[model samples]
Target: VRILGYDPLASPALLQVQIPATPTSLETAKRGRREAIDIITGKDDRVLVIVGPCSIHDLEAAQEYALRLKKLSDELKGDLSIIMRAYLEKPVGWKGLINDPDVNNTFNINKGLQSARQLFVNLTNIGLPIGSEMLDTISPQYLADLVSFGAIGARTTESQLHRELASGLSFPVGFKNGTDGTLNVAVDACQAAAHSHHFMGVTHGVAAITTTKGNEHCFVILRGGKKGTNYDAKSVAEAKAQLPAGSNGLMIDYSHGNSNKDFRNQPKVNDVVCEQIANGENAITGVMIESNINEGNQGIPAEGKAGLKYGVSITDACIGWETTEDVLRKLAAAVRQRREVNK
Candidate 1:
């Protein structure tokens, strides 16, 4: 292969220079991580809601969305722990914001990372926990500190590299069931990540081999897969039974294969999940939703952002804000009922 280009990479320290995390942000991160751990481990009786656009491509839109979500999170603080999904990575096609922040194929990752960090720090300053998928193993060096919760996508659930990465994360991590509808890989991942592992790593933007004490805050996420929707009560019970002892309860994504990739069906799936929670399903500790300012998704134009619709996802189609608000209120109400019944 012919080498066509080489842009000298900047260290994570350099990027933190343009956009640094303040004391307030650090405090928020610590609080967020603590709360997330509590909720997942059943020490906190609140359902963790990781909701946001499928992938972030526009900073302005994300800011607006975050503000609205912040308001909702405050209003429902007693019932739900809302962690805004500010994912900057994708499993396949059309890599997220960090790969192309400008909506065009400029591949200006430096700008992308800067924007991602700025947005994350800003959200934390607002007292909102940030959740993101850990896609590239090294990207965490730039943004992991600010994140309260992290996720390992289904495609990488069985990968040794990702499990190793999860082992060392500063915060809790969730591993998704395989794309083929099997929970074995994810269960194995959780077990593996809960123990020490050694691997090649990066430090200060330089390659370095390192080892880590495996993380115990790792859990499973059932987003469904090729075999079909696994968000139902039966599916969750089966999955939970297979989890390694002491693992936190599993999470479910309303979108993805659970809704059969149909955005409109997300609400239906969510309704069912909430009902399960209301019926005393403590094994379900969290739920994820793909939502945006606008409903549905669009293709990135060869021309760029000028041709794309504002606030809509350029990756997965998502429920609109109106649907998001309605569903969240319902979820909160369900949690309220569950609490009353238990009391």
Candidate 2:
């Protein structure tokens, strides 16, 4: 039997060997993140692209993807503001996903922790900053400092703990619509996050009581739902209309339910939003896309990688880089056209 009651995460001995990012670097990331958020919202002619895998299983692959995306971002710097979707926590879904990598109570705990941290560190070192889903409160304390953007995913948008976490975060956070198609969830999320809250979260690896002074960098995302689709102009208008008084505008997700679970349909959804923008619908502040180095998805192997395709996804099917680039170019052009029309 093990003699240790619980492993100590706060012990300086554990962190001694690990070289962590300086607070200065983390603060710079925070500043850059807020500016990116503002850029997405302030300009009707600029489209924000949150692009990456659904979840990261391998560190090397994610790093490679990040470097490649960094080059692409520079190439298209004039058109798109790119944020790396360095998603570490996979939601449990309805019955739930296999298990959240960050939670790591089940799967290989030690490996999960290492992989999650390593991926974030590597991605941050790349030219692209990170965007991640705020599923659990503790996970943020570990890696959020390296991220530029935070997301309260569709399932966790209304979660009290997540809202509290977002409130205390130093970066911009986007709250996605409820899975059941409720805009109130996100609207209330923005309000709640803007107010201080006393909540429970792990601090320095110990469960501790904490108070958050609220988050002003909070925004809403229209990802659609089972009963109501919020990606279109009418739905977006309704979501905006429901904002709980004071807050930034909303972000729109072209993937997920808006794509009707059809990965190939992302381009179509993007096209519709682009058209809306060209037609002078400027209420939308940003957009999200599920994209990878390649298109579509494949099943995660029980063990090895004999059949798994490189650049493909293991969770949801993603739009390939080529198609993704094409879609982004058109969206950029659309943003320009919309701005020209509006001006």
Candidate 3:
């Protein structure tokens, strides 16, 4: 006997399935993602701005923020490509949920699954292509179908397993420098992901065998760390030197160790990046910012909402929306000026 009623994979009655989208939908997203990657890597000569919350806590907050970003994208598409950091999973260092509480903690399998699905779908519908970090290999099965771009954070940049996952991913992906500010990890990560692999992974509701053709859309993100700041001219030159000819340059993060983990100092870091970009530093392919409706972080009390403040992050400190808009516009203007000067 095959258990209770029926076998799930082989029986419709026991299976919950979503028919794959019409081929047209898949093709459109794939092409849209390719174009977005070209823009992000500077091959299209367009600046790429990856701006969003440090981590999405409330779907409403993320969408509200995305709505504003869509407007900004329209406003800047002439000079830049925009990618929303619709990160659903978090990579914790010291303590806290190994996975963020947003999609996996407070909300579990059934509810979290619904929450993840709705956010990705809504963001894509808004006409702004979405991006996310693939932390847990299994989590991608839930949302990668909806994202156009992806990233592997610095903490896991060197893991062979993570690199294998990146190789199989369909959309463009960015691998960040190690937490200690070394570029070798990211350089190696990019190359590793750019090659084919035979791997083990999950399939729809089951563990399965899989092989990947490798991903061509892999790049590096420079988030400075331990030894000192790597966002400077010397560091940029050094990081660029590591990339083989005809490789994507780098995506500089204005948060994390680059700003010394200080939220308010992000603009100072952005200014330096803008200046470099304006000076004809084509080595910068993109930039990342951590911003939110509020100016800084709040408590994630043992109790919950009563102890936590609205619009504040429990993970990393983020600049308020108002300040972010100004800095973004400055970068946009700097890009405009950079092209004008070159001409």
Candidate 4:
């Protein structure tokens, strides 16, 4: 055998049964996707806000943050429809909660999957739908039903397998521009996922040629690659032109390259997005914010979780809860203003 080692991975069906979702969470997800589509397609005037920590590290911290967001969700329901980011995975050298729930290198994937699924169940039960990056194709089968908005990060937007995966997803997906700032491939991804495809994948624990029904809810996300920030008017306009007329054009991430990887700049990106909406700009369907209970992120010191800071991001830096509320209030106000402008 060419492989070094092997582990007993839990089947998706088994995991789903073990960590089951109730009618409450399922309905929460249903409403989440429905509202997400409405906002994106302009069927609803409310702004889509995907807001939360960069990743989920501590379950207690995440729970606390979710409860707060749920309350905020109710308060801002009129102008903004919110989805909490419950990302449990990341890019290269990735060991998010699913890969290393303990933040140590045990690499116990089955345990990670169980914990992640349970987290989704808990959050959705809290009445806040989930948003997560569709990093691995296999993981979706493990947890997709609980998710509302799925993201194809900048690194994977051009991968054929990722595009194929998007076609079959029940929830709406957003593909980000290339890491080098090319919108063409992201737009291409949106177009590709809108058509049916036959790809190799695991369907309920068996290797199968999965055929898709062509998901039409795919859109582009401008995360700003190596070139520069793309949350501005010209960048937004350029991205919108690449889309079909009367379609939901774009969702922008205020973190990542859009803020040049500096969380401090997140507010500025958010402010610009709000101003656009206030000015009657409809091309920007949604906006993303990396916000946690704490103001900024910290490194998982050499000792691991023992030395890590509580409620702070372990990946990207994030704006604190106070700033998060401020940003959302402003966004809701912007949406309100847009309604007036149209009237």
Candidate 5:
């Protein structure tokens, strides 16, 4: 183990379980894209809501959350387009399931990848569009088609590789401003992702050069800056000004900076954004939150998943389930209120 022991992870194709979409999950992802595009493009008068646990550490608890979320999505489908925010990669929340499924030191990524694929497929089948955050170039190959929505996080918003990857991705993508809350990088990314590009990539685990037709569905996410929140009306408008016409207006993240890095402040930020929408801020297309079935978060105990509380986040503390419901209901009403104002 001097330099670093190397082991062959199974090729995405060789997984036998079919890392690609199955018939049912494929429908879920396809329809997810179709509806997401319409909502973002203004063809649909609905607010896109991306909410869920900060990270999925407990499978059973996540399943419970998804079931409840699907039911609520059905109840509010007309006013809100809902997608579960599934962050499986430090992408945060315990080194992500892909990097450390057990939350233990064992790095059994081969198992983790398969587990994640299965989780995506199952979740999509439950009738909610799945939104995920991503960056590592090759890892996406195994799960891209399964995720309906994706994003470029603030830290990697300026990475050329991610920008190029977004350009070629098959689903709608959101680009966050830099960690310092600078908008230029994300704005540039939005433009860069909408243009075709030739970049180094992989095909079925083989090194390859890839070409793309450009992704027109990319949008900007004002996740607030290092200094503080930016979900204010003025900031929202400023971000929208530079967005492409087809891109989702402004998808503000209530967590991170908007929440002032405190999950408790999410509702405060949520209400502000909701009020703007209710006041008819038509340029605001979507909102995201780091939430879970339970409120707050805790460090993984030595007992790992067993010692961890169910449905609570192991990463960022999140608004509890009831709070999530309240936020969703309020957002739906904001869209309704917007419609009333438009009429």
Candidate 6:
């Protein structure tokens, strides 16, 4: 075979042994997933807020942010279920911590995997539920047990492989609309993920084929695409109408096309969502926000970590921590108003 030599990755078992999940982290994951599933099934009335950086490039920054998020989550637990976006996989450029822990182009995946797992352990240990996007098919085996919420990107919304992956996920998964600004593909993906399937996969860090019993905790994420923003009332109504029966509710992403790719605009989009929720729009159960310790993003320095600002995003721009707190507080108030009116 004309190919570069393969580098060995620590087996899932081996990695687990090195960074084993503590009782606290395990309970956090279990409870987090349960609450997420309940919200996805419409069994819980609280709004689900998935907020964090676009990608975790630094563990120290993430830990600091997680501690703050944990406090806010506990305070708003009555009105909202907060999940920290600890995505370690990116489908396109930069790939993420699991693929490039070092800002340099080393691609030291062994260390990447270790850092990603340890970060999850540390965050979950603090009682914050972790959320991530499943990009690489097999990477999930290495950390899915610690995730409370998962997502399939708009780029892969129609891929059969992602549908199969979602089917086997233990946590509720959101299928974002296609990048071309369409919903049928995501709808189909959700339906596909709900049915049993046989597919190629890995087990115990070894190549193995497997079957899935199908995941019913699947829903849609309306992340507006090239066409325009979809978090407005009309868009949400249109999406809800097209969703398959028995869906708990739909989620709207305040980032991406909806924000016109501008981090500063996230709050406005979030406001519109909260408006709908406050007006008794029960079908809109959740919202996604891209935020970090600092505001905005910067290019990675050719030199490395020193070239970058601490806590800022290197991929997509994100709202600062202050803005994040304001958004969550407003959403919590909106949820409270919603409950009062319904009563």
Q: Tens digit of lDDT per residue, candidate 2, span 132-157?
A: 88767665666666788888867677
Error of 5 at 33 (Å): 0.7
Better of 4 and 5 by TM-score: 4
> In candidate 4, which residue ranges exceed 4 Å CA deviation?
92-94
Give a tens-digit lDDT track for model 1, residues 171-203.
999998887777788888988998899878888
Ranking of candidates on lDDT, top first: 6, 4, 1, 5, 3, 2
Go through the candidates in order and give each one's C-alpha lDDT.
Answer: 0.87, 0.72, 0.74, 0.88, 0.83, 0.89
Lowest-sum lDDT 10-residue window in model 6: 87-96
| Model 4: how far residue 139 lies from native, Å | 0.5
Q: Write the per-residue lDDT of candidate 6 for residues 1-343, one digit (tens) a residue.
A: 8998988878888999999999999999999999988887778889988999999989999999999999989999999999999987555467679777886776888898899999999999989999999886888888998999999877788889999999999989999887777788988998999999997778767778889999988888999876788999998887888877777689889997899989999999979989988989899888999999999999877788888899999889999999999999999999999997789
**Could you tell me every candidate's TM-score relative to the true structure?**
0.95, 0.87, 0.86, 0.97, 0.94, 0.97
| Model 4, span 1-343: residue lDDT tens | 8999866788999999999998999999999999999988889999888999999988889999999999999999999999999998657544898889888877878889998999999999989999999987999999999999999866678899999999999999998877777778877888899999998999868898889999889888888867788899988887777676645657899997788778999989888989998999977888999999998888778898899888999888999999999989999999999999999
Model 3 regions lying over 4 Å from their true place: 1-32, 92-107
Over all chains combined, what TM-score does candidate 2 have?
A: 0.87
- Residue-wise lDDT of candidate 3 within 256-323, one digit each (tens)? 77888899999999899889888887778788888887878775666664566777776788898889
Model 5 bad stretches (over 4 Å): 1-3, 16-20, 241-247
Candidate 2 weakest lDDT stretch, 10 residues: 94-103
Structural RMSD, model 3: 4.8
